[PDB]
Amino acid sequence: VQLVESGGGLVQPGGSRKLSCSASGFAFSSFGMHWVRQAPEKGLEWVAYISSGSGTIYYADTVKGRFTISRDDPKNTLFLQMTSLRSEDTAMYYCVRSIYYYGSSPFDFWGQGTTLTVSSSDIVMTQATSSVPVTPGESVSISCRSSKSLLHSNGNTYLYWFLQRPGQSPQLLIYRMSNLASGVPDRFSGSGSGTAFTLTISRLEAEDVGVYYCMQHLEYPLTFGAGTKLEL
Amino acid sequence: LSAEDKAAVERSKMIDRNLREDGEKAAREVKLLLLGASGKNTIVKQTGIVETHFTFKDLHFKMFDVGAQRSERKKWIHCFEGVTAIIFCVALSDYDLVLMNRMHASMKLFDSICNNKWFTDTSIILFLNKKDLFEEKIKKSPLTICYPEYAGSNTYEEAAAYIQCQFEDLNKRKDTKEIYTHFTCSTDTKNVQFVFDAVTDVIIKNNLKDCGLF
Amino acid sequence: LLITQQIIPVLYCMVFIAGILLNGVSGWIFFYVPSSKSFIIYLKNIVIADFVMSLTFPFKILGDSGLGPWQLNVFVCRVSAVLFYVNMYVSIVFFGLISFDRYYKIVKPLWTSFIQSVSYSKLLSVIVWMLMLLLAVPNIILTNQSVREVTQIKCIELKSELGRKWHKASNYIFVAIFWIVFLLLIVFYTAITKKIFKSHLKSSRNSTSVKKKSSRNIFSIVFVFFVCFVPYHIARIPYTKSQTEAHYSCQSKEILRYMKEFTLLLSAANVCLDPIIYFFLCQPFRE
Amino acid sequence: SIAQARKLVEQLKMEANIDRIKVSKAAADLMAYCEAHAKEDPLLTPVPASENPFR
Amino acid sequence: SELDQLRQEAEQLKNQIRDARKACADATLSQITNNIDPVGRIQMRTRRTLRGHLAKIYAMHWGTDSRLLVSASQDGKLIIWDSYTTNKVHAIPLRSSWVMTCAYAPSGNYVACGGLDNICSIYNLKTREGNVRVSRELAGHTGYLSCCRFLDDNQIVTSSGDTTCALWDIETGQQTTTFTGHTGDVMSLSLAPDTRLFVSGACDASAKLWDVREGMCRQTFTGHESDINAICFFPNGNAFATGSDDATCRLFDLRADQELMTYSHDNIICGITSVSFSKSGRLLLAGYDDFNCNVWDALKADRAGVLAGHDNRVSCLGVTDDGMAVATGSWDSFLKIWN
Ligand SMILES: O=c1ccn([C@@H]2O[C@H](COP(=O)(O)CP(=O)(O)O)[C@@H](O)[C@H]2O)c(=S)[nH]1
């Protein structure tokens, strides 16, 4: 189970470049694939989304009309056509898989990342905590806020967590309230109600340094938050 | 509906179309049940049950042999209600061997199968085997050991005709099912040709009765 | 001069009684047969059309009988005749579709282009119904707009464009549709019969039973269709020619009226024979 | 044969060497259980449409 | 001849057992419950109708969450449903199409199947990849499998048509224990809530109660007159009900070792396919061959109502863990949820 991204480089303004990603080790045709970019010193931004069956295509306002997304199931390859470049497109692009049914865990795996350098009604997510020091063997709490309550009429709350290790791709820790993903130690817990969210780490280890992130999944502008940095 | 709910509905629709395609593909097969009491060689080859799949003149066949299921039939017969036909194999030279009489047991089994309540409209294909051995040994032993009331010519053709009549005259309610008879051979795939002809006739009748004109 | 006021209403009363007595019970096809993409839907629509046909008889009985208010004549000229004609032509088209379905389900010669047609039965039924209605909707609201009082012996009171040439055009389109459907049905059933005869059947009573039943039913359907529906469509066009104009005497119009009335009486009496011919042979309909 | 008959006899002896209680006591226990658990039974006592997911 | 002596001893033991059963009978449950309030009238409607199968449904099972259920059908498919929204989560294609039983793991991880191929298969639902694969194919029976039930994620119990019931270990793949003593084909199995004992009903018109740890038969109940087709425990683990082809359900008690009550009406001349209880055990549901289900009063032997609406034989039905709904499967290839 691995994802490899290819392409990129340096393109003058007004040019074009087509990113590509390759997957192996799972059933590619039965997954939905996302695109997420990251500015050189800023947070994570959502770009485009394609679903299984190619029946649902969602874009972002900043990139609408200049970007095209497509997939090829037989070749296990994903593409993102990109024309009419600007000076704000400088970032490092990712590739994420997502599957949806009753009880599934979306955004479980993350790609590696390629860098592209170019020469020159949305829910607001707020998390002001940042640059908080940590000490091994001590409890740490991380907060998060949103404009609208995330509790739907079906009894669900659509909020996610991510961890950005130094020089590494994000790892999904908790996908919904009181839910731990596979491979996560039983010391991370998440609770809250409505617009109040929290994440509890009972005993932090050496591998618990990095940047944490929030995410909502209610409707389809996709918004992240300026991550909270914890350092030893 | 929320995003995950809509995606779940999309997954359900994909499952629906896959199931429908599989059913549409599988509805055009010919299913046959093989029974006996008598040698399945040249008829099956040419634990549990055994599948056998082959194609002959653009038709997909499935032959099920249930000879190893030694249990009460009346509790798994009803799984084979929708089979297209039944193939029945009888030994033609077991009249003079005691297991009671082998061919009497064959007649009893045939009667029980043909007069079952699940097979009121199922055609029966009858294969009679070992005709060469029966003809070779008919001269050294008379037919009175099995059927005392023959009173006729002691020749192979007359004996075969008498046996065929005896087996064909046991179907009560001979208005909804037809019994075919054949003497097996080993040349030119004549057995497969006979099975093809029988199933073609049955399929034509079934389409006529399904379209509602008969 | 004595046919109109003496004979026709009695025959309409008889066919009305028979049609009620049959269809009022046969209407259970609308609920007994479980819904499917089979040819049952066509039979349900035919049942509905026959039932709607069953209701236009009493008004014509009263109108021809010479009793009742004179506004019933314009009511008949306004609504009832149009409804009767629409239902008859819808029934014709559904019979043709049943013939096509039987051909393509027994023979299967050219199922290549119709692979995606399982769920299109509802679309086809809706299309036929709406086409017939929209070709007959104009002559209910836009007809008999100025019923007069002079010469109360005539039912062409249509004025300029919503009237005479439009009436002619609708009649011509209807007769053309019937002829096309008839030719398609006869060719398809002939092909089915030729397919059925090819099977090599002998040395049993079951095979001859099946062949006899098939041949008898097919010939019965075709013969009934022809006898019940041909003469009226032979005689209709000259009736329109002698109705829109005169170009003749009274006798050359009187005999045309007589034949139109009699052929239409037979074509109406065809409703009472549909149940036994079509709905009785179906196995699911007997449970 | 002999072994099967001996096994059947042993099984019958084991079945016989089993204590039993009164049928009246068993019926009383069943009635007590059914009466005690009567309140929490959606099929026996119909529930309002608010608490029924199938609605 | 020792055979005659053994037969005489067995007859004497049977006579002693019958005498003890007669002596243990003081009063009847009907006499005791003749003075209790009757259930008035039950009119359930079809809240949901699950569609998608293309052949006769032979078995179904409920999940522990009371929302997810699995169905088995002769077209070689195994569907997991979402009862609240009528969605399909998975569609498992099997190798052999002659399936006759299905089970849902109590942990929600695995499923099982079996039939005329003598092999009980196991599937894994939660994997790193996005598909369900076969984890094990247990073999070792000589006749067909009739019923299969899970004890945990590592143990399975099955019943066969060769008069034997076996306990398997999934990791090893071998028969840990085999229970023998029956005469005809074994048709139904049922596990107690304590998961320490179970009962089987065979075609010799008998009932046998086993013990998993020891591996022996405890008691024998003989009241029926024909084949036995279905078994189901009372919630309290002290009683169970049986279905037979002589148009008669029956209720047996473990502590008294005797038949307590029978159900029979002069208008019922068909068989019984499935039997289940409600959460409290007051209402007993039995599926009949006459195209509809009957609701019986388990304490007064009265006919409460009829759940009609199936156009063919009902072969399987079960009740949720919380007692909130029932679902009946039938040969007409439909599932209906009644509340
Ligand atoms: O194919 C036709 C022919 C006629 N019509 C209309 O029916 C009404 C009565 O017509 P009719 O029965 O010819 C009167 P009469 O000749 O009996 O005195 C008028 O609106 C016609 O335009 C329709 S809709 N379809």
What are the structural domain ranges in chain C? Answer: 8-286
Q: Name the residue with tokens 């009803």.
A: B78
Q: Which amino acid is at E100?
A: M
Number of alpha carbons in the 13 Å side-chain half-sphere of residue D37 = 19
Q: Which of B5, B15, B79 sits opposite E98 (nearest CB)?
A: B79
- Interstrand relation of E197-202 and E206-211 (parallel, antiparallel or unpaired): antiparallel
3-state SS string over chain A? CEEEEECCEEECCCCECCEEEEEECCCHHHCEEEEEEECCCCCEEEEEEECCCCCCEEECHHHCCCEEEEEECCCCEEEEEEECCCCCCCEEECCEEECCCCCCCCCCEECCCEEEEECCCCCCEECCCCCEECCCCCCEEEEEEECCCCECCCCCECEEEEEECCCCCCEECCCCCCCCCCCCCCCEEEEEECCEEEEEECCCCCCCCEEEEEEECCCCCCCECCCEEEEC
Q: Is C174 in the pocket of ligand 1 (CB under 6 A)?
A: yes
Beta strands in E116-235 (DSSP E): 120-124, 133-138, 145-150, 155-160, 164-169, 175-180, 186-191, 197-202, 206-211, 216-221, 228-233
- Interstrand relation of E164-169 and A228-231 (parallel, antiparallel or unpaired): unpaired
Crossing angle of helices C40-53/C8-26, nearest 10°? Answer: 140
Provide the residue range defining the domain that includes B56.
29-208
B61: which 2 tokens? 């066949």
CB A63 within 8 A of CB A19: no
Nearest to A126 by CA among A213, A44, A190, A188: A213
CB E73 within 8 A of CB E51: no
Q: How far is CA E308 from the centre of its chain?
A: 21
Nearest to A92 by CA among A69, A67, A113: A113
Q: Name the residue with tokens 């060719």.
A: C187
With residues binned 3-state (H G I as helix, E B as strand, rest as coil), the percentages for chain C, rounded to 5, are: 75, 0, 25
Query: Facing residues of E103 across strands?
Result: E112
Q: What is the DSSP letter of B109?
A: H
Contact C210 B212 (CB under 8 A): no
Q: Is C8 in the pocket of ligand 1 (CB under 6 A)?
A: no
Nearest chain E alpha carbon to A104: E126
Nearest to A60 by CA among A81, A77, A46: A46
Give E287-292's long-range contacts (Cβ < 8 A, gap of 24+). Answer: E287/E314, E287/E315, E287/E316, E287/E317, E287/E328, E288/E314, E289/E313
Query: Would residue C76 be called left, alpha or beta, if left means φ above 0 and alpha means ψ between -120 and 50 degrees?
Result: alpha
CA-based R_g, chain B, Å: 22
Residues of C in contact with B214 (CB under 8 A): 210, 213-214, 217, 281
Q: What is the DSSP letter of C34?
A: P
CA-based R_g, chain E, Å: 20
How were these coordinates obtained?
A: cryo-EM
Enumerate the H helices of chain B as residue ranges.
3-26, 102-114, 131-137, 156-168, 190-210
Q: What is the DSSP letter of E67?
A: S
Which stretch of DSSP H or E encloses residue B87?
Answer: strand B85-91
Give E176-183's long-range contacts (Cβ < 8 A, gap of 24+). Answer: E177/E212, E177/E215, E179/E210, E179/E215, E179/E216, E179/E217, E181/D7, E181/D11, E181/E208, E181/E217, E182/E206, E182/E208
CA dist A62 and A47 (Å) reads: 8
Whether CATH 3.40.50.970 fits C8-286: no
Q: What is the DSSP letter of C276?
A: I
Domains in chain B: how many in total?
1
Identify the three-state secondary structure at position E109.
Answer: coil
- Chain A residues in contact with chain B using a Cβ-Cβ cutoff of 8 Å: 32, 51-53, 55-56, 100-102, 106, 152, 154, 156, 158, 217-220
E300: which 2 tokens? 């007064």
CA dist C186 and C99 (Å) reads: 9
Q: Whose CA is nearest to atom 20 of ligand 1?
A: C139
Identify the three-state secondary structure at position B84.
Answer: coil
CA dist B150 and B144 (Å) reads: 7
Crossing angle of helices C81-106/C121-136, nearest 10°? Answer: 150
Across chain C, which distance is largest between two alpha carbons, in Å?
76
| Phi/psi at E231 (5° precision) | -135, 150
CA dist B84 and B87 (Å) reads: 10
CA dist E298 and E292 (Å) reads: 19
**Residue C118: CB atoms within 10 Å:** 10
CA-based R_g, chain A, Å: 18
| Phi/psi at E250 (5° precision) | -145, 155
C23 contacts: CB under 8 Å, gap ≥ 6: C47, C50, C51, C54, C271, C275
The alpha carbon of E230 and the centre of ligand 1 are apart by a number of angstroms equal to 68
CA dist E323 and E321 (Å) reads: 6
Q: What is the resolution of this structure in A?
A: 3.0
Pick the CATH number of A125-231 from 2.60.40.10, 3.60.110.10, 3.40.50.2300, 1.20.120.1200: 2.60.40.10
With residues binned 3-state (H G I as helix, E B as strand, rest as coil), the percentages for chain D, rounded to 5, are: 60, 0, 40
**Which CATH number is B105's domain given?**
3.40.50.300
What Cα–Cα distance (Å) separates residue E178 from each residue in E138, E142, E158, E160, E175?
14, 13, 10, 11, 7
Contact B212 C204 (CB under 8 A): no
- Interstrand relation of E155-160 and E145-150 (parallel, antiparallel or unpaired): antiparallel
E87 contacts: CB under 8 Å, gap ≥ 6: A101, A102, B8, B9, B11, B12, E81
Q: Which amino acid is at B184?
A: T
CB A4 within 8 A of CB A20: no
CA dist E101 and E116 (Å) reads: 10
The alpha carbon of C143 and the centre of ligand 1 are apart by a number of angstroms equal to 11
Q: Which of E219, E279, E319 sits opposite D15 (nearest CB)?
A: E219
Identify the three-state secondary structure at position B70.
Answer: coil
Q: Which amino acid is at C38?
A: S
Identify the three-state secondary structure at position B183.
Answer: strand
- The CATH homologous superfamily for domain D2-54 is Transducin (heterotrimeric G protein), gamma chain (4.10.260.10)
CB E305 within 8 A of CB E318: no
Strand order in the sheet with E206-211: E186-191, E197-202, E206-211, E216-221
Q: What angle do CA A221, A223, A225 make, to 5 degrees?
A: 170
E262: which 2 tokens? 């029978």
Interface residue A25 vs chain E (CB under 8 A)? yes
CA dist E152 and E195 (Å) reads: 9
What Cα–Cα distance (Å) separates residue E122 from each residue in A29, E53, E89, E216?
25, 21, 18, 27
CA dist E339 and E278 (Å) reads: 12
Q: Name the residue with tokens 């194919």.
A: E137
CA dist C181 and C103 (Å) reads: 14
A84 contacts: CB under 8 Å, gap ≥ 6: A14, A16, A66
Interface residue C193 vs chain B (CB under 8 A)? no
**Which CATH number is E158's domain given?**
2.130.10.10
Which atom of ligand 1 lies closest to the CA of C82? Answer: 24
E265 contacts: CB under 8 Å, gap ≥ 6: E303
Query: Facing residues of A211 across strands?
Result: A164, A229
Identify the three-state secondary structure at position C232.
Answer: helix
**Residue B53 burial by Cβ neighbours in a 10 Å radius (0-12, 13-18, 19+):** exposed
Q: How many residues does chain C have?
A: 287
CB A222 within 8 A of CB A62: no
CA dist B68 and A142 (Å) reads: 67
CA dist A217 and A225 (Å) reads: 13
Residues of D in contact with E29 (CB under 8 A): 23, 26-27, 30-31
The alpha carbon of E317 and the centre of ligand 1 are apart by a number of angstroms equal to 60
Residues of chain A with CATH 2.60.40.10: 2-118, 125-231
Q: What is the DSSP letter of B80?
A: G
Q: Name the residue with tokens 């068909």.
A: E270
Strand order in the sheet with A67-72: A2-6, A19-24, A77-82, A67-72
Contact B49 E203 (CB under 8 A): no
CATH class, domain A2-118, is: mainly beta
Query: Facing residues of A59 across strands?
Result: A48
**Residue B192: CB atoms within 10 Å:** 15
B69: which 2 tokens? 């299921």
Q: Which chains lie within 8 Å of chain A at 3 or more CB pairs, if any?
A: B, E
CA dist C45 and C19 (Å) reads: 16
- Interstrand relation of E216-221 and E228-233 (parallel, antiparallel or unpaired): unpaired
What Cα–Cα distance (Å) separates residue B69 from each residue in A91, E59, E200?
68, 21, 21
Q: How far apart are the first and last CA of chain C?
A: 50
Number of alpha carbons in the 13 Å side-chain half-sphere of residue B106 = 25
Contact A99 E129 (CB under 8 A): no
- Pocket probe mutation, ligand 1, options C170, C244, C254, max atoms within 8 Å of Cβ: C170
Alpha-carbon dihedral E259, E263, E268, E272, rounded to 10 degrees: -60
What Cα–Cα distance (Å) separates residue E156 from each residue in C103, E133, E150, E168, E182?
53, 18, 5, 5, 20
Nearest chain C alpha carbon to B202: C207
CA dist E334 and B167 (Å) reads: 41
What Cα–Cα distance (Å) separates residue B24 from each residue in A165, C115, E91?
51, 11, 16
CB C267 within 8 A of CB C228: yes
Query: Number of residue pairs across A and B with CB atoms under 8 Å?
Result: 36
Residues of D in contact with E20 (CB under 8 A): 16, 20
Nearest to B39 by CA among B186, B146, B151, B145: B186
CA dist C51 and A210 (Å) reads: 78
CA dist E130 and E146 (Å) reads: 31
B179: which 2 tokens? 């019994």
Provide the residue range defining the domain that includes E51.
2-338
Would you kindly state where each structural domain of chain D is located, as residue ranges? 2-54
CB A160 within 8 A of CB A107: yes
Q: How far apart are the first and last CA of chain E?
A: 63
Q: Which amino acid is at B187?
A: T
Nearest to E110 by CA among E73, E138, E135: E135
